[PDB]
Amino acid sequence: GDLDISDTVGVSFWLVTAGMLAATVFFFVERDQVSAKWKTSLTVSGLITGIAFWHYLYMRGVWIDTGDTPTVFRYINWLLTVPLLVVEFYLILAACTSVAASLFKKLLAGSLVMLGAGFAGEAGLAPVLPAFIIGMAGWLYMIYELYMGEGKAAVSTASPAVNSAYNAMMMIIVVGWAIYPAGYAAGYLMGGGVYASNLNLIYNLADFVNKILFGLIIWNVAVKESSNAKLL
Amino acid sequence: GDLDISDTVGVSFWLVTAGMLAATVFFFVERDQVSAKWKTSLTVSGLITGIAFWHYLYMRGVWIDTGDTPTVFRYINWLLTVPLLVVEFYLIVAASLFKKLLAGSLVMLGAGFAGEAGLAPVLPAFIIGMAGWLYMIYELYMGEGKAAVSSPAVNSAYNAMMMIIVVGWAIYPAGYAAGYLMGVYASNLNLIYNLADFVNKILFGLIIWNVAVKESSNAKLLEH
Amino acid sequence: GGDLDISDTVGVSFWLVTAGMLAATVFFFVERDQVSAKWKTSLTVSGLITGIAFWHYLYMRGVWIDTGDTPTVFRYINWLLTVPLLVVEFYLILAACTSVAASLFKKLLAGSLVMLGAGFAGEAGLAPVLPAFIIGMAGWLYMIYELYMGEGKAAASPAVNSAYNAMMMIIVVGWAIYPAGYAAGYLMGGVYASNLNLIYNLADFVNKILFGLIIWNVAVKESSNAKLL
Amino acid sequence: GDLDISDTVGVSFWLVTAGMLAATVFFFVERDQVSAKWKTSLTVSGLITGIAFWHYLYMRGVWIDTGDTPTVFRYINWLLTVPLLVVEFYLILAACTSVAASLFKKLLAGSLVMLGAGFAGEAGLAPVLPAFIIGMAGWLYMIYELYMGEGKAAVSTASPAVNSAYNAMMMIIVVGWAIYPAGYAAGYLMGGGVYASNLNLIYNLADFVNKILFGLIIWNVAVKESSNAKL
Amino acid sequence: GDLDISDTVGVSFWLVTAGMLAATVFFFVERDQVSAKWKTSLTVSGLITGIAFWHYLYMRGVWIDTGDTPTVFRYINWLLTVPLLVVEFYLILAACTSVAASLFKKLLAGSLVMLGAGFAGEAGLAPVLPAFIIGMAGWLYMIYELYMGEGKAAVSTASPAVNSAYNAMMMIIVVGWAIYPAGYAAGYLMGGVYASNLNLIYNLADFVNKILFGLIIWNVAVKESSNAKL
Ligand SMILES: *C/C=C(C)/C=C/C=C(C)/C=C/C1=C(C)CCCC1(C)C
Ligand SMILES: *C/C=C(C)/C=C/C=C(C)/C=C/C1=C(C)CCCC1(C)C
Ligand SMILES: *C/C=C(C)/C=C/C=C(C)/C=C/C1=C(C)CCCC1(C)C
Ligand SMILES: *C/C=C(C)/C=C/C=C(C)/C=C/C1=C(C)CCCC1(C)C
Ligand SMILES: *C/C=C(C)/C=C/C=C(C)/C=C/C1=C(C)CCCC1(C)C
Secondary structure, eight states: OOOOTTOHHHHHHHHHHHHHHHHHHHHHHGGGGSOTTTHHHHHHHHHHHHHHHHHHHHHHHHHHHHOOOOHHHHHHHHHHHHHHHHHHHHHHHHHHOTTHHHHHHHHHHHHHHHHHHHHHHHHTSSOHHHHHHHHHHHHHHHHHHHHTSGGGGOOOOOOHHHHHHHHHHHHHHHTGGGHHHHHHHHHHSSOOOOOHHHHHHHHHHHHIIIIIIHHHHHHHHHHHHHHHHHHO | OOOOTTOHHHHHHHHHHHHHHHHHHHHHHGGGGSOHHHHHHHHHHHHHHHHHHHHHHHHHHHHHHHOOOOHHHHHHHHHHHHHHHHHHHHTOOHHHHHHHHHHHHHHHHHHHHHHHTTSSOHHHHHHHHHHHHHHHHHTTSTTTTOOOOOOHHHHHHHHHHHHIIIIITTHHHHHHHHHHSOOOOHHHHHHHHHHHHIIIIIIHHHHHHHHHHHHHHHHHHTOO | OOOOOSSOHHHHHHHHHHHHHHHHHHHHHHHGGGSOHHHHHHHHHHHHHHHHHHHHHHHHHHHHHHHOOOOHHHHHHHHHHHHHHHHHHHHHHHHHHOSOHHHHHHHHHHHHHHHHHHHHHHHTTSSOHHHHHHHHHHHHHHHHHHHHSTTSOOOOOSSHHHHHHHHHHIIIIITTHHHHHHHHHHOOOOOOHHHHHHHHHHHHIIIIIIHHHHHHHHHHHHHHHHTTO | OOOOTTOHHHHHHHHHHHHHHHHHHHHHHGGGGSOTTTHHHHHHHHHHHHHHHHHHHHHHHHHHHHOOOOHHHHHHHHHHHHHHHHHHHHHHHHTTOTTHHHHHHHHHHHHHHHHHHHHHHHHTSSOHHHHHHHHHHHHHHHHHHHHTSGGGSOOOOSOHHHHHHHHHHHHIIIIITTHHHHHHHHHHSSOOOOOHHHHHHHHHHHHIIIIIIHHHHHHHHHHHHHHHHTO | OOOOTTOHHHHHHHHHHHHHHHHHHHHHHGGGGSOHHHHHHHHHHHHHHHHHHHHHHHHHHHHHHTOSOOHHHHHHHHHHHHHHHHHHHHHHHHTTOSOHHHHHHHHHHHHHHHHHHHHHHHHTSSOHHHHHHHHHHHHHHHHHHHHTSGGGGOOOOSOHHHHHHHHHHHHIIIIITTHHHHHHHHHHSSOOOOHHHHHHHHHHHHIIIIIIHHHHHHHHHHHHHHHHHO
16 A cells, blocks of 8 residues: 555655654764764764654554544653753753753753643643643743753853854754644644644654754764864 | 553553663663773663563553553563662672672562462561562671772762662552552552652663763873 | 565565665665765765665565555655755765855755656656656756756865766766656556566666765775875 | 463573573673674674574463473574584684694584484484483583593693683583483473473573573673783 | 474574574674774675575475475575675685676676576476576586686785685685585476475575685684784
């Protein structure tokens, strides 16, 4: 049975699964193109893409066998991978800020509320819009604390590579992550049934941008910095 | 079809299965950032998560398929993994302590199993289980443990292995207690076991990793 | 559970190329330790191209044997994932030769996406077969154009030159087998299912394995030469 | 359904399967902890544990499914691994004596007689008692050749590591290997019926001792030498 | 159930499958015991045994389910692996002569005629005996070109290791490969198909020529790499 090109959510799942699998191999193998300062970052990136891979196989499974949005798998994957992205965030902060381990506590706290509220909405354990609002709070609390709350502590200019990582991190958590709540709105906040296709299409683009492309930017910083240190 | 959310135990199983997979990969890959002094410790850590992963697939499998607590899978998994944790201490008087810790661990698990499998009433089983566990902690003080291991990095490792067997390990008897010694609560029992395996196998290996990476970086830094 | 059907010529070809991508992937990933930092990402990308092909070859061949129909979607999804990856390789190479390298990447991607879009519309019956072929060649020739004339018309290293040529050579001579196969299938005025698949499978072998091999040969030579210091 | 605890043999296969899994990973991954002097040894060590894992999977399948002692799988496994262990013995002996090549041939001949006889017994192609004796002769001919025959050549303490590995080889053939004929006696040479439970339990233990544990001995010696030689 | 010991060839398939599995692992892992000169060699060797393994798994499936000879899996396996052994030969040849590229194309052409012929026979596409003679000609032409043709161009003392690898290559294509036609002869060239002998001989041939030949190269390479460091 060839892929059904009409099942475009079907195809999206397929594409992203391959993207996850590839990225995963790429992050692990390229660990040797970066130095000890950078290796653990690549491990975590690969680990994030890796877990998404397996969860993508299951997500696609259920879509195709039932045509229902795979909410529980979706959130289980976020539950597992969001904390690790937070760990990448922490790893970056620890290079340029005194408050890195305290921030990590609050960023984690943000993310759990963000995710729990989201899930409540989609699970029908809470009305959609209220749940969206609390979720948004969670996400925004993280942004707040990172740049305006406790995070305002240090913006150490010391390393061009660390500024890049820091820049990339901001970019991902602000515009990067914005794709998910966009997804949630499209699916649940237009006119009450669920617009299941557009929900999943957007979620799928968001995991690609946020798991694969973020990983990719960090690797590029990592390789560039690694190579300049070699020259010297 | 989609994962059934109302099955909290099923979900917990899923999550730790993934945690174990992830940790196993992480320990193996990260061996390249720790000196020869630490590599084997990371191997052993990866082995523990590895075995736990396979056993989590089956434990989960049983739960979804029948609703029964996978007691034998659980205990067999501990039987394979707990010895490897004790090995990690020997890697740190040594051969004597290992043998004593092993015996403790085996008395501990044996009694636990006895109770859960119905080969002994649960309370006496709990006491002998507790005795075995308690004997392990004892041997790390007045006993053969008062051999002040020369090496700060060795000490941070040892301290953290000291702490895990005391506070980390307590989650299991807590698990047993919840399930068998309250007013069987299979659901609560499996939730605490899951959490205990998660904390103890992942975080402990994370500790060793952390010490090892720090020690190794410092030692390559003094190579100037 | 029987022996491979010998009558089924298309099956044998799928089977073979499947194996070839499998071998190739292992080859490229393993051999990374025979090339320098300057070349390693190339080999990775090379390996990911063949690895992703491998998985899709497994599905393609299963679609063929179980139904006998042509695996258009699996075939195009495969190229959608691998072609940009091949363009990334051109970018990686071109990062030496010019400072305009990031521009070319953007343009070559757009060209190739058009090339595959046209082709797909053709085989999918979303657009008539012959005009689809035309827009197909447009994207392709546009790619070839921007490399030979236009922007890619720019320049300590005797290896980046061979790899450059390798690229210019393959995107012209190598990639040609694809529209050659499309013509064979849909442009004889039914659909020539077997010829199509045989040529595509042949093109994939040549362009994914043999291209990867050329880069490997350049990287290996350069790394052992630069080692003499 | 959960593992059945009353099926002792069943549990034994499960434990040993998993041990073979872990040890395979252990011996491969740990190769970067030993010098070029020892790597191939750890490779062969992981191969033996590796091949044994796959066979343990099948052996356990058979038992769980039929209750029959999985003879052919057992001896197929031994046929693939014993020659490898004999290869490891040759490598050690290479560092000790000039007679190393003929010893290897002699030992391979011994072990094949040994395994052939044992198998004929268990598969019912020969009486269980005489097969055992020929089995034992092959085994004993190996031991003889190491201790009194062409192997009385040179103990030659070239290295403290080579000397440790040599002695490890010398012990295992005797004390470690002895578990197998003991298991075979227990299963075929003591009763009315075949004592399959004991037989499988003892073989399981013997694979564990000889593949996993003996592999760890080579690993131990090899890590110590390599770390010492580096400084 | 337990493996069926009466099925000699069943068991034969089992034994070489596992040997291919082991040998693939051996060769990839052991690359860190040889220097850059030899690493690709070991990679090709692993690739040969790796392809063989996957094919042996299908070949055994076919022998159990049907009891028939898996002729197409076998030749498909050979079609993938022989070109690779020839690539290996070219790598050996390149350190010994300057006519290596010409030799590679010659030997490959030889080997495809060799395989196409044997297959045509076994598949029933061509009478069994003329097929044998033709396939045999392809082989012999390969042996012609190495000993008396373009191969007469040069030997090499440049290294005693390259000289060993050369010698092994010359030996293998003569005594090693000879096991294959012997098997065909056994199977199709006696009375009115001796399927067991054929398959036993071919499994033996794959073992000697893929696993054992591989081991010889590996050995040359570890000696040479170990001396090089000294
Ligand atoms: C790897 C996955 C990542 C980094 C996922 C991030 C997901 C979010 C930031 C989701 C956010 C949501 C809101 C901010 C509003 C309520 C529910 C959401 C979950 C979809
Ligand atoms: C990797 C798994 C580990 C380290 C498991 C450890 C389990 C224990 C320390 C359990 C202790 C128990 C008691 C002290 C009494 C009741 C039964 C218990 C076994 C689970
Ligand atoms: C790994 C796959 C690669 C590099 C595929 C390349 C495919 C092409 C260059 C296909 C080109 C086509 C045309 C130029 C005409 C219209 C449609 C085609 C797709 C088959
Ligand atoms: C990895 C497995 C190994 C090294 C197995 C060795 C098995 C033996 C040495 C068995 C010996 C036997 C006899 C000496 C008496 C006859 C029957 C036996 C085969 C089990
Ligand atoms: C890895 C497999 C290899 C190297 C196979 C080699 C096979 C041959 C040299 C077969 C030769 C045959 C003849 C020389 C006569 C014609 C029929 C044969 C194919 C089996």
